[model samples]
Target chain A: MIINNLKLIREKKKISQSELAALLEVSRQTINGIEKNKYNPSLQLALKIAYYLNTPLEDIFQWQPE
Target chain B: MIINNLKLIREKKKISQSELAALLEVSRQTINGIEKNKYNPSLQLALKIAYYLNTPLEDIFQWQPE
Candidate 1:
């Protein structure tokens, strides 16, 4: 399943989607898609996001039992 | 950069590539590709792998500075 706290963390950091995307070197739509859980990210991208948010990777993404 | 401990972990678990591939519902080549760092995994696949290996995602994959 998909799990992400990007939107919450992004808002908490006071950064807009475009701003976060710029920092993450991705497009705004990509950020939007990730926030919405439209698709999963590459491991590299996920790591970048976690680093950008200054959180543990698990803080940003969780895995639910299937 | 690419980082993965799948091969080491898999070997430790006494599972072959094909067995892990079946467990992960991916091709043997895909498993090999990931183990070889030929590519990064999708977040979903990565999460499944972490769960299967009973390890944290960060334990299996790491991010290095550019």
Candidate 2:
């Protein structure tokens, strides 16, 4: 169920995981885990991320049937 | 940070909490709690809800700084 353009978008924004984490008030590991698909963020965190990235939520993450 | 248009949208669709719960494979209470803003869903559940509702994720839930 994990489909994300986070890595691509993050790089396009020229922000490091730590930088994005700081903006989101989450740990760098949390950002890393999300980018790596090792973690699934809560809706709250997802919104924060989308907001910070200036991207539509759907553009950043998608749900695919398993 | 709690903001949702779930109740409005669900009612618009004429779906009860029980019906939504069944559709989302969650407990009715889960749907109730989410509708009541007493719960925060995981990203997976949020995406599922958005998908089922045929609404954008941003329209369903939003984060506001407290």
Candidate 3:
């Protein structure tokens, strides 16, 4: 099971990694890591990302079936 | 800060540990542990539990400030 696949969502929203990192107050590398599925955001970071993305939490991050 | 305080929500919904466990396909002990804040579900289990409870993911589990 996969915890996230955020690349598709980021592309859909037309936001670059640096732009999203600025919006979320994280470094560009962190955003890059998140999009690459190499990092799991803290719960607060996750919520802030969802809020900034203007999407439901589940829409942005959800469990994937194995 | 708390990741979950599920007892309040569970009681509000009138569901016991055993009942919620049945609905979520987990052990009753697991439900009890979650309510006690002693267990953290994997990403998949967290979403399934949120679905079973008919609530947003954030409503069920989230970060708290230190």
Record all residue pairs in model 1 with backbone atoms less than 3 Å apart, i.e. clashing. none
lDDT of 3 by residue, A3-30 (tens): 6545677787888878878876788899
- Model 1 is docked with a DockQ of 0.57
CA shift at B13, candidate 3, in angstroms?
1.0
How does residue B6 of candidate 2 score in lDDT?
Answer: 82
Query: What is candidate 2's lDDT per residue for A28-60, written digit by digit as tens?
Result: 998889899887667777787788888866677
Q: After superposition, how far is residue B44 of candidate 3 from its true place, in Å?
A: 1.3
Q: What share of the true interface contacts does each candidate keep?
A: 0.56, 0.75, 0.41
Two-way TM-score contest, 1 vs 2, winner: 2
What docking grade applies to model 1? medium
TM-score (all chains, Cα) for each model: 0.81, 0.90, 0.62
Prediction 1 TM-score vs. true:
0.81
Best candidate, TM-score-wise? 2
Better by DockQ, candidate 2 or 1: 2
User: Is 2 or 3 the stronger prediction by lDDT?
Assistant: 2
Candidate achieving the largest DockQ: 2
Clashes of each: 0, 0, 0
lDDT of 3 at B41: 63
Candidate with top lDDT is 2
Candidate with more favorable, higher lDDT: 1 or 2 = 2
DockQ for each candidate? 0.57, 0.73, 0.37
Ranked by DockQ from best down, the candidates are 2, 1, 3
